[PDB]
Amino acid sequence: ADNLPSDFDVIVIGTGLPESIIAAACSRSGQRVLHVDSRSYYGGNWASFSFSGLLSWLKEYQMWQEQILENEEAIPLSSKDKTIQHVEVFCYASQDNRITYSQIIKEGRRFNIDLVSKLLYSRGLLIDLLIKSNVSRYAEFKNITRILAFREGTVEQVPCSRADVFNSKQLTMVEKRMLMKFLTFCVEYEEHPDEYRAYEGTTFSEYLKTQKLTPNLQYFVLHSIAMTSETTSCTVDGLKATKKFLQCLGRYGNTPFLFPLYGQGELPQCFCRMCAVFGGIYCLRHSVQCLVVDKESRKCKAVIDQFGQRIISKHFIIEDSYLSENTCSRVQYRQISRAVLITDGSVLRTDADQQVSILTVPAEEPGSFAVRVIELCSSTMTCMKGTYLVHLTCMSSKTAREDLERVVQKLFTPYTEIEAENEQVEKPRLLWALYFNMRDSSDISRDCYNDLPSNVYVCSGPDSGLGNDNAVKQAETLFQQICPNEDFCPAPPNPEDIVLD
């Protein structure tokens, strides 16, 4: 044994979140799974890195014909990843309360920089899947403690939990009445189908206009509570979002969001573990050269790895980045604008340092999209003590820097050796910044890809949204095609399910 087996039921290429969930599901159902990756770490474009690991990651973006048997043809795979672009790095801190770049390097292992900036809702596809499958035992979570809004070009905490409201007076009593009344209504908008009657055909932002709501509250709801594309979302879509938001409140904290200790990057490994636990065989630093197609049936028969080994399988799951440019000549990708910052203070300073916040900045110019800002504190185990890790994300328009620096500039001020009259009133300092674009291959039809056999499935990378619903949904959909009528990631066996005398 210990020699890699030459046949499996399922072969999965890429250890991104979607891929790992589907590998877990197949393995859990009883399929012999082989899960490979070309990188030396798990995650693919869902990974997180130590500071030193990130600099190495940055770098990059700045043997089988004799195995093809009779009656077969090959579909070469990609050998070079091209999902990242426009990498821009800036180090404002000094090179060697003042955090120098040298301190960052020394404590580099205290950082866990996610390539993907998302959050978990108290209830949703991923969290519900973590609890049901028990993959949740593999992680610890932190609660988001603050919802922030950006109006008038200024930061401010938005009261959400019906309590948080009555513990503040940032709103008149005429607006508060509109609030409870409006929220209590959204919490069950489908019970009063007379409030969004004719607005069904129109968008949500449009709908909010003609409501018993000022512009202020109309703002908070539209950008901080619903958080939906105020343009690319109709009334229903908008109300449904608010309901989701509100219902998730108070389940764990004063907001509807949780963040995994050590970062989003832990999620794919959690699922990969479940796959392993149930028999999955893992191989990192293990690329596949090509797919082997049966000229007769037209089904994919096997793969040939970088070592020249033929490995047979019934189903083949491949993450988009591994397909050749030829296989992808017609695909129209979208892009994700990302920015990672290491700061020495919170966007909104307070006594209680260890806070995890999410700020929403609406698009200012046409053609651009809402920017999501997530602030992590050291106790989230993603950055060293004394700093904050801020993640900015938005669907792309132009390059990452062009799309986001504008927002970074309004919230942070580049570190300098210029002491100001009073720092406590000064904007937080930016010590180090990274900008980059990531390919968005989500919501792309299978047929957009050329000549891929029917038993070859494709996984997309991450999307630009706040949650992981796209990662779960596609996995679930895949499982339905590979294992018809089978509980998806059922809960592992338990002696307590059926209690006897």
């Binding site: 130590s50 573990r273 392993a276 636990v277 065989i281 191989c283």
Partner: protein, 169 residues
């Protein structure tokens, strides 16, 4: 109330999973090992130990960083009848420090288990393994047999005491 995370490292086939099952379940065999929990007394203090199995991801040296996060103690196991599993002890130790980034890594609690001593065709000498264990900042060395349950209980008593040290320091 104190929870300790202990991981057991080493090449495939040395007995890691059996050492875990023998310690917690007092049962030996010859699929599906994940992690076991055991309540133990360390010098009168009550602690909880959480043993994490590799789920076989080391078969192709594919253990990820998640697996090492916050480990309080790292058990390094080798097969006394397979000299090559002893030579990889350094590589597994280096890997642990790389992925776990523990506080004060030069004094991190490593316990080494020379397993399968019940087998007659031993290839690695007790003295040799002790010299290496000593050279590595004097880490504890126990010779065990998961099959005959020899030295496992005592080996884990030290693993537990050392785990609690790292967890408290």
């Amino acid at each position: 109330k104190v929870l300790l995370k202990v991981i057991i490292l080493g090449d495939s086939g040395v007995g890691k999973t059996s050492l875990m099952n023998q310690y917690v379940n007092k049962k030996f065999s010859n699929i599906g090992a994940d992690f076991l929990t055991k309540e133990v007394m360390v010098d009168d203090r009550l602690v909880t130990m959480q043993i994490w199995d590799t789920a076989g991801q080391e078969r192709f040296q594919s253990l990820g960083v998640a697996f090492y996060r916050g480990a309080d103690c790292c058990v390094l196991v080798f097969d006394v009848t397979a000299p090559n599993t002893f030579k990889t002890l350094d590589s597994w130790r280096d890997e642990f420090l790389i992925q776990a980034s523990p506080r004060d890594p030069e004094n991190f609690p490593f316990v080494v288990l020379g397993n399968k001593i019940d087998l007659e065709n031993r290839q690695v000498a007790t003295k040799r393994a002790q010299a290496w264990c000593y050279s590595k900042n004097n880490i504890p060395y126990f010779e065990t047999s998961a099959k005959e349950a020899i030295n496992v209980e005592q080996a884990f008593q030290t693993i537990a005491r050392n785990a609690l040290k790292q967890e408290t320091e």
